Curated annotation (Swiss-Prot):
Coiled-coil residues: none
Residue intervals of every RING-type zinc finger in the record: 8-50
Subcellular locations according to the entry: Cell membrane
First and last residues shown, out of full length: 129 to 181 of 325
Protein name as annotated: E3 ubiquitin-protein ligase EL5
Domain of life of the native organism: Eukaryota
Induction of expression: By N-acetylchitooligosaccharide elicitor and by protein phosphatase inhibitor calyculin A. Induction by N-acetylchitooligosaccharide elicitor is inhibited by the protein kinase inhibitor K-252a.
Domain-related comment: The RING-type zinc-finger domain is required for E3 ubiquitin ligase activity.
Organism: Oryza sativa subsp. japonica
Stated role: Functions as an E3 ubiquitin-protein ligase in cooperation with the E2 ubiquitin conjugating enzymes UBC5A and UBC5B. Involved in root development. Required for the maintenance of cell viability after the initiation of root primordial formation. May mediate the degradation of cytotoxic proteins produced in root cells after the actions of auxin, cytokinin and jasmonic acid. Mediates 'Lys-48'-linked polyubiquitination of MBP in vitro.
Gene: EL5.1
Length: 55
């Protein structure tokens, strides 16, 4: 398949319809609403690059 798109740096699951992926403004890296939340647990920023979302 086309393994060249938005990969979840947390669960690494092809972002498909039915989930709530959250993309950030600094970069746009799209992650899951669930993985992006468990990935926070302290880091309030993007999990792949680390571009905080709050200004
Ligand atoms: Zn995920
Ligand atoms: Zn990012």
């Amino acid at each position: 398949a086309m393994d060249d798109g938005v990969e979840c740096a947390v669960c690494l699951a092809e972002l498909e319809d039915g989930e709530e992926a959250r993309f950030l403004p600094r970069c746009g890296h799209g992650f899951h609403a669930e993985c992006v939340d468990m990935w926070l647990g302290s880091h309030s920023t993007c999990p792949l690059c680390r571009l905080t979302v709050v200004v």
